[PDB]
Amino acid sequence: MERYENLFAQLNDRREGAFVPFVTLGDPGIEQSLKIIDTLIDAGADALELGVPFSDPLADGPTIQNANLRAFAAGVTPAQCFEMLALIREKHPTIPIGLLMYANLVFNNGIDAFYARCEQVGVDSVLVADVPVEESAPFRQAALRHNIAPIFICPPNADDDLLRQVASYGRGYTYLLSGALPLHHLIEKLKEYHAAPALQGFGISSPEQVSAAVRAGAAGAISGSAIVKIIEKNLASPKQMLAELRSFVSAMKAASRA
Amino acid sequence: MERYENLFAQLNDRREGAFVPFVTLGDPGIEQSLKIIDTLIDAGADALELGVPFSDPLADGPTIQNANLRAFAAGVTPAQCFEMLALIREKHPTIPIGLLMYANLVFNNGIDAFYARCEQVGVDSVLVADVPVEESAPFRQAALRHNIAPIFICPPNADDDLLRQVASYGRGYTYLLSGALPLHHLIEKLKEYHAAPALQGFGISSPEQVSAAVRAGAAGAISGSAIVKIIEKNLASPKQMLAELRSFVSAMKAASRA
Ligand SMILES: [Cl-]
Ligand SMILES: [Cl-]
Ligand SMILES: [Cl-]
Ligand SMILES: [Cl-]
Ligand SMILES: [Cl-]
Ligand SMILES: [Cl-]
Ligand SMILES: [Cl-]
Ligand SMILES: [Cl-]
Ligand SMILES: [Cl-]
Ligand SMILES: [Cl-]
Ligand SMILES: [Cl-]
Ligand SMILES: [Cl-]
């Protein structure tokens, strides 16, 4: 539906980088999560990265792990997540919606049925976070068949071989994480290979990291856990939670004008 | 085959905690990896946790991520991993072998065929690191049908409800990661619910953390990345690599007598 392409062209109009918050769907409840997402959008978030609750405790930090636990504790299921996605899309027809999920989600229903469901509710992109590039073909092909952008991660030490693969396979945006190479170097190479615009997603904790990413040439930044941390710290006061989310998104967008 | 039960009873004879190193199969090559594993065993490792190369770059630290990349760069496939596992078991018939892997590995062949292959090569336990407990039943049942211990992770804030589930579902050992609760408290509750012996697996970097785990009552410790770091730092000298691995395992076992 051109949602990412239109966003990045309009961000070019505004001379801004994208700010894309991550939240877990259904954290800390279905309705609070919907209102958290409305607040992020109203405060200036350019796109959304939304997680279907998963479990990766060996690797995840306490923030993301606790969010997954809060959503499961609220009884959140993939079914409810897809209904939430549909509602978000209906209220916000133009905002790019990226799903972040883990491979076992597609076991119960099958790869094509999963991507068909994404297409039906209006998702724009899907990142299956735990599938190596060597095993990505069935996901990439199913995504394209259903008009979904498959998101590929560019790791910090990617050689030109891998950069060429990431640039060619992905659509929508490139999820950049940056024997690491210089940030500006990865960005330049991805542009040389006509990759989808790069969103720096590593360690985007606060305004300084957004500004650094845009100054290095990235198209924007993805905040992997900073929004979830504000949720966790304000669980007892939804009003203060929403106010802190607004000031945070505002400060992150200010950094995106750097 | 009683490999974990026999190990823990013999560790009780020795008044020792278990030390269980993690390595990625095929890192930095098939034959170097086999010899790394032989060296860990000869140096005193009590069991093995072996990873089939995966990809979890959003969450993994550089050590584990780089190991996965080194193994894929050596052309390692799941097929070669299963042959390596078979060779390790043939050379070392009594040592408990735990596989650590990610869910997409079971997509290509199916859940039952994966666990059948594990049983055939002599694996004792399987931890599918990225499957929530709410979705674990098909894996747990397939494991039991093939005489494989399914490994469950006890997270640091587990309530008694979850502790009861982890204690009942798992076999072999409990993979302990420790609003977190006191380490000794989780250990006590797991014993109260007759869980498989707990191996503390969070942050086991050096001897101090092994000693802390055993002093708190854990049956031992799993070093998630410390062995891989020694591999990465000594890639240019296999001889020095193996010598540093020996001194490291020796120091970790010394801490396990605490
Ligand atoms: Cl679109
Ligand atoms: Cl529940
Ligand atoms: Cl290169
Ligand atoms: Cl695109
Ligand atoms: Cl950087
Ligand atoms: Cl982060
Ligand atoms: Cl056994
Ligand atoms: Cl290769
Ligand atoms: Cl409780
Ligand atoms: Cl057992
Ligand atoms: Cl601790
Ligand atoms: Cl670790």
Q: How would you write chain B as a 3-class SS string?
A: CCHHHHHHHHHHHHCCCEEEEEEECCCCCHHHHHHHHHHHHHCCCCCEEEECCCCCCCCCCHHHHHHHHHHHHCCCCHHHHHHHHHHHHHHCCCCCEEEEECHHHHCCCCHHHHHHHHHHHCCCEEEECCCCHHHCHHHHHHHHHCCCEECCEECCCCCHHHHHHHHHHCCCCEEECCCCCCHHHHHHHHHHCCCCCEEECCCCCCHHHHHHHHHCCCCEEEECCHHHHHHHHCCCCHHHHHHHHHHHHHHHHHHHCC
B12 burial level (CB within 10 Å; 0-12, 13-18, 19+): exposed
Residue A170 CB partners (closer than 8 Å, separation 6+): A149, A150, A151, A152, A195, A196
Distance (Å, whole) CA B120 – CA B92: 15
Query: Residues 83-122, chain B: which have Cβ within 8 Å of A?
Result: 102-104, 106-108
Nearest residue in B to A176, CA atom: B58
Q: What are phi and psi of B14, to 5 degrees?
A: -85, -5
Cα–Cα distance measured from residue B68 to residue B66, given in angstroms and rounded to the nearest whole number: 5
Side by side, which strands form the sheet with A198-200? A149-150, A125-128, A97-101, A48-51, A18-24, A220-223, A198-200, A174-176, A153-154
Q: Do B56 and A57 touch (CB under 8 A)?
A: no
| Chain B residues lying within 8 Å of A179, measured CB to CB | 66
| Residue B149, φ and ψ in degrees, nearest 5 | -75, 120
Q: Show residues of chain B in contact with A66, CB under 8 Å.
A: 157, 179
Q: B87, B37 in Cβ contact below 8 A?
A: no
CA distance B162 to B152: 11
B125 touches B173 (CB < 8 A): yes
Contact A180, A156 (CB under 8 A): yes
Whether the link from the prior residue into A238 is cis, omega within 30° of 0, is no
> Does residue A171 contact residue A145 with C-beta atoms inside 8 Å?
no
> Tokens representing B231?
């591999």
CA of B125 to the centre of ligand 1 (A): 44
| Dihedral sign, Cα of residue A164, residue A167, residue A170, residue A174 | positive
Candidate from B59, B62, B107 with C-beta closest to A60: B59
The alpha carbon of residue B13 is apart from the nearest alpha carbon of chain A, in Å, by 31
Task: For residue A188, list its beta bridge partners.
Answer: none
Strand B18-24, strand B174-176: pairing = unpaired
For residue A24, the cross-strand partners are A51
Kindly list the protein residues that place their beta carbon closer than 5 angstroms to ligand 6, a single-atom ion.
Answer: A 224-225
Residue A65 contacts B where some CB pair is shorter than 8 Å: yes
Closest-CA residue of B relative to A107 is B107
List the beta bridge partners of residue B51. B24, B100
Sequence-distant (6+) residues with CB within 8 A of B220 are B11, B17, B18, B19, B20, B46, B173, B197, B199, B200, B210, B213, B214, B256
CA distance B13 to B6: 11
**A113 CB contacts (<8 Å, ≥6 apart)?**
none
Which resolution in angstroms does this entry have? Answer: 1.8
Q: Which one of the ligands is nearest to B187 CA?
A: 11
Q: Are B107 and A107 in contact (CB under 8 A)?
A: yes
Tokens at B117, concatenated:
């292959």
Which residue among B72, B108, B155 sits closest to A65, beta carbon to beta carbon?
B155
Q: How far apart are CA A258 and CA B144, in angstroms?
A: 57
Q: Pick the residue of A22, A54, A55 with the most B CBs within 10 A to test the interface with B by mutation.
A: A55
- Give the distance from CA A217 to its chain's centroid: 19
**Strand pairing of B125-128 and B149-150?**
parallel
User: What distance in Å separates the CA atoms of residue B54 and residue B36, rounded to the nearest whole number?
Assistant: 19
Distances (CA, A) of A183 to A17, A174, A186, A190, B20: 16, 14, 5, 11, 37
Q: Where are the domains of chain A?
A: 1-258
HSE-CB of A141 using CA atoms within 13 angstroms? 5
On the CB side of A226, CA atoms within 13 Å amount to 25
Q: Which CATH class is domain A1-258?
A: alpha beta
Chain center to CA of A70: 19
Beta pairing partners, B50: B23, B99
Q: Report the residue of B52, B54, B56, B58 to disrupt the A interface, i.e. the one with the largest count of A CBs within 10 Å.
A: B58
Contact B201, B175 (CB under 8 A): yes
- Type of residue numbered A78: P
> After which residue numbers is chain A interrupted with C–N beyond 2.5 angstroms?
178
The residues of A annotated with a catalytic role in the active site are 49, 60
Q: How many angstroms separate the CA atoms of A209 and B154, rounded?
A: 34
For the annotated catalytic residues of B, the residue numbers are: 49, 60
- Nearest CA to A17 out of A129, A188, A173 is that of A173
Query: Which ligand is closest in space to the CA of residue A164?
Result: 3
A201 alpha carbon – ligand 6 mean position (Å): 7
Give how far the C-alpha of residue B184 lies from the chain's centroid of Cα atoms, to the nearest Å: 21
Q: How far apart are CA A235 and CA A238, in angstroms?
A: 7
| A75 CA distance to ligand 2 middle (Å) | 4
**Residue count (chain B):** 258
| Three-state SS annotation for B125-183 | EEEECCCCHHHCHHHHHHHHHCCCEECCEECCCCCHHHHHHHHHHCCCCEEECCCCCCH
Tell me the C-alpha to C-alpha distance, in Å, between residue B247 and each of A80, B14, B42, B205.
Answer: 52, 20, 11, 14
CB atoms within 10 A of CB A181: 15
Query: CA–CA separation, B153 vs B166, rounded Å?
Result: 7
* CB of B204 closer than 8 Å to CB of B221: yes
Any A CB within 8 A of B141 CB: no
Q: Which of B160, B173, B162 is nearest to B219 (CA)?
A: B173
- Which-ligand-closest: CA of A1? 1
Concatenating the DSSP letter of every residue in chain A gives: --HHHHHHHHHHHHT--EEEEEEETTSS-HHHHHHHHHHHHHTT--SEEEEPP---TTTS-HHHHHHHHHHHHTT--HHHHHHHHHHHHHH-TTS-EEEEE-GGGGTTT-HHHHHHHHHHHT--EEEETT--GGG-HHHHHHHHHTT-EEP-EE-TT--HHHHHHHHHH--S-EEE---PPPHHHHHHHHHHTTPSPEEE-SS--SHHHHHHHHHTT-SEEEESSHHHHHHHHTTT-HHHHHHHHHHHHHHHHHHHT-
* Cα–Cα distance for residue pair B53/B71, rounded to 1 Å: 7
Report d(CA A220, CA A253) in Å as an integer. Answer: 10
Contact check, Cβ <8 Å, A55/B104? no
Residue type, B29: G
Rounded to whole angstroms, the Cα distance separating A131 from A106 reads: 12
How close is the nearest chain A Cα to the Cα of B54, in Å? 6
Both tokens assigned to A29: 């409840």
Angle, helices A226-233 vs A238-256, to 10°: value is: 160
Match 């990766």 to its residue by tokens: A56
